[PDB]
Every structure is written in structure tokens, then in C-alpha cells.
């Protein structure tokens, strides 16, 4: 078994629908053309709609710290279009996580083992310009790659 990954090397290929980490545009049919990343880009290249995933923090399992881990990620969705499109985009992103967990999807960095919302999709104030924001917390579960 390999080392456990950082959570971005597992979640992002599941949301993007391809294993190329260098290319942030997603291709999964529910999210065709949204930008999926961990860091909001500078305003001279920032493109909406976008989904931002970042670790709010959850532990290794105490049973076997080197074999299973449960990272909580804050997932967020932003749009310049309208609030209903921003809700629908968060629902359509969460539906990919609940499917990719059921199928036990392999990623070159690790396996997405399970998914659980700890704080559901919710509306909040956006940091920038015209845009709307919807966010929530997901406790994931990750298993190391089978090397």
C-alpha cells in the first residue's frame, strides 16, 4: 500500500472527471465547463462558475493512522448568473460525490471510500463583485493507493 494522499489529489479528479491534475475545467456532464480548484485565481484570469474545495480539517482514524483517514472539506460553489444556478451547481456537485463514493472510484493518488455531509448546502455572503456563494462541509473517507 502507498502513503495516504492530501485530500485535493483525490477529490479533484472525482469532481473534474479526468486524472489530469494540470487542467482545472471539469468535464463530468452535470458540471461541464465549471472550474474546480482549491485556490481562487487572480481577477485577471478568474473565471466563473467555479467550485472551491479546501480542508477544514478531520483526523486520521485512530485504529490505523497509516491505513484510513477522514478529511473534512469545505466545498463551495460560486456563480455570476443567479442564486438558483449556484444552488443547483452545489447539488449537482454533491450528487457526483455521493455516486463516486458508491462506485469506490480509484484515483492515482488514492480511493474515495465514503462521503457524509456534516453541514449541508447553505447560502452565504460572497467575497467578490456580482457573484453568489453556496457552501457546506463534507466529511470524506480516503484509503491509500494499492501499490
Amino acid at each position: 500500500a502507498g502513503k495516504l494522499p492530501i485530500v485535493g489529489e483525490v477529490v479533484l479528479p472525482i469532481l473534474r472527471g479526468h486524472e489530469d491534475l494540470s487542467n482545472p475545467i471539469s468535464t463530468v456532464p452535470s458540471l461541464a465547463g465549471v472550474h474546480v480548484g482549491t485556490w481562487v485565481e487572480d481577477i485577471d484570469s478568474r473565471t466563473f462558475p467555479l467550485i472551491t474545495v479546501r480542508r477544514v480539517g478531520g483526523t486520521r482514524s485512530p485504529e490505523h493512522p497509516t491505513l484510513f483517514t477522514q478529511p473534512v472539506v469545505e466545498m463551495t460553489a460560486y456563480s455570476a448568473a443567479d442564486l438558483p444556478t449556484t444552488e443547483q451547481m452545489y447539488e449537482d456537485a454533491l450528487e457526483v460525490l455521493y455516486r463516486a463514493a458508491r462506485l469506490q472510484t480509484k484515483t492515482p493518488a488514492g480511493y474515495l471510500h465514503s462521503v457524509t455531509e456534516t453541514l449541508g448546502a447553505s447560502h452565504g455572503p460572497s467575497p467578490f463583485d456580482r457573484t453568489w456563494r453556496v457552501f457546506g462541509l463534507i466529511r470524506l473517507g480516503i484509503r491509500p493507493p494499492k501499490n
Binding site: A1, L67, Y111, G141
Partner: protein
């Protein structure tokens, strides 16, 4: 031995049933079958019991197993005896109310009229072969019982904000000369697994030397040009160490494979032209 690849967190469990005595798909087929569609398998006859929750798994249990330590007025702690035999079972919560999922709970439909499912007042005999496939990443540990007897484990649960449930208990019973039940995975059971063997890797052999940890301690520095018996004797500087007997090295790869009774790993190095590297895979 410790086997990190044989440690399980069941993510999901798929439960199937069939007519009594029918065979499960073979240990090599559990790596290849599509679990959503038992209608498509080579080993035809299975059907998926219905929607169980995404949150929980088939729950193993047993009655009996009460054991006592016995002896004599002479010698007091002689033998352990089992005073009630282990009666071994699984509980499955079905959460759909279709006819094909009531039938596992109540037994066969006692009424012929369209739109009615009826039950008679007496006991019923309801038996299946039972297959459970328990899934975790690429591990798909199967479990198969040639005959199981299915009974109501509790009343139908209905609730305002959690799913309605039909809890069945499947108890395992002997059928013909077969086993009571079998666990299935090709990699774990009756497999002829290889020794753990450590592969060395190096730069272009331009620089000086490298060091190896053997168990909890380091041998000395050694050069890129060293013979297999020389590096085997350098590893042999260890507590159980017998060079040309306890450890083995055979140079099958262009850089050496080490096999023996302790872990091996890189320490500090100065072999310029790349890096020293060591891993436990061949």
C-alpha cells in the same frame, strides 16, 4: 504475519439470494463481475434482495457459544467445552416494500388477487442460498451460504423521517456434504503468496557510496561496484547474521534484490548520478 492489504473497512455490502444449493461466482470472477446486475453474470441464478441502506451493512451474529473450563478432582483446568453450539446468522435490513422484498420477510404471497399480498397465521419455511459481497476499494470479500433459513428478526419499522425497514435474519444450516458457509477472495485464502523481498535502486553509479538499515540498525557504507557476496556479507553484520546462510541475494534485476528475516531500507547516501532508493516490491 502482518498483511496491510488484508485489513478491511467494509464501505458497502451487496446481498443476493437464490434457490437453495446454487453456487456463488468463483473466486477469480468476484474481481470481474458487475455487482449491480446479477442477471448478467456467468454464474446465473442470483437476484439482489433490494435496497438496503447506504449507512449500514449486513450484521453478523450468533446464539450459543457459551463455554466452560472443566477438569477432575485431580487436575483442575483440563479442557474447555462448548455447552451450547454456536448458531450462526446474518441480519439484513431491506428498505423496499415490493413483493420480491416482502417475500423474504413474510414468505410466499398467500393471495392470488392483483394488488394484494396476504399472510397466513402459521409458521412458514423460507430457505435460500445467500451471497454477500462486501466491498472496500479493490477488495471484494465474498461470503456464501448454500442454505440459509430466513425469519422475521423484528416487526416492520415505520418512521416519520427515517426509511421504513423489513429486518430479516438468515440462519445458516448444513446442506448435503457442503460447508456451512464460505468466505471468498482469490488473493487471501489458499494462495501461495511470495516472501517479502526488497529491491535496491541507484543513480548512474558515478559517485561514492550508500548505507543500509537492516532491522533497527545500520551497516557500514558500501560502493556501487560491490559484488553480491560482498553486499550480502555487509548486510550479514547483524544480530542473527549468517552471511551465505540466513540472508539471500541473487542479482536477478540489474540492481540487487534482498530476501531475508529482517526489514531493509536506505540510510544516508553519497552515490552521485541519481539517488539511492529501496522498496519492498518485485
Amino acid at each position: 504475519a502482518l498483511k496491510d492489504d488484508a485489513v478491511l473497512i467494509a464501505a458497502r455490502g451487496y446481498v443476493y439470494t437464490a434457490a437453495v444449493g446454487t453456487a456463488a461466482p468463483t473466486p477469480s470472477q468476484l474481481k470481474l463481475i458487475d455487482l449491480e446486475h446479477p442477471e448478467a453474470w456467468d454464474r446465473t441464478g442470483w437476484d439482489l434482495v433490494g435496497h438496503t441502506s447506504e449507512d449500514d451493512l449486513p450484521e453478523f451474529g450468533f446464539d450459543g457459544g457459551d463455554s466452560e473450563v472443566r477438569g477432575s478432582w485431580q487436575k483442575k483446568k483440563l479442557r474447555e467445552v462448548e455447552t451450547e453450539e454456536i448458531a450462526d446468522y446474518v441480519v439484513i435490513n431491506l428498505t423496499q416494500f415490493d413483493e420480491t422484498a416482502l417475500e423474504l420477510y413474510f414468505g410466499p404471497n398467500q393471495s392470488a388477487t392483483p394488488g394484494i399480498f396476504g399472510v397466513k397465521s402459521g409458521s412458514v419455511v423460507n430457505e435460500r442460498a445467500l451471497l454477500i459481497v462486501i466491498v472496500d476499494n479493490d477488495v471484494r470479500l465474498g461470503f456464501h451460504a448454500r442454505k440459509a433459513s430466513l425469519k422475521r428478526e423484528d416487526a416492520i419499522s415505520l418512521a416519520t423521517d427515517e426509511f421504513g425497514a423489513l429486518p430479516v435474519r438468515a440462519t445458516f444450516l448444513d446442506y448435503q456434504s457442503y460447508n456451512l458457509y464460505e468466505w471468498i477472495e482469490e488473493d487471501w485464502f489458499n494462495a501461495v503468496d511470495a516472501p517479502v523481498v526488497y529491491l535496491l535502486d541507484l543513480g548512474g553509479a558515478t559517485g561514492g557510496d550508500y548505507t543500509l538499515l537492516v532491522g533497527g540498525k545500520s551497516t557500514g557504507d558500501i560502493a556501487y561496484n560491490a559484488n553480491a557476496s560482498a553486499i550480502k556479507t555487509a548486510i550479514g553484520a547483524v544480530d542473527d547474521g549468517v552471511a551465505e546462510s540466513a540472508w539471500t541475494v541473487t542479482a536477478d534485476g540489474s540492481d540487487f534484490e534482498i530476501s531475508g528475516p529482517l526489514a531493509v531500507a536506505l540510510g544516508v547516501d553519497s552515490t552521485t548520478g541519481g539517488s539511492g532508493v529501496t522498496v519492498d516490491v518485485v
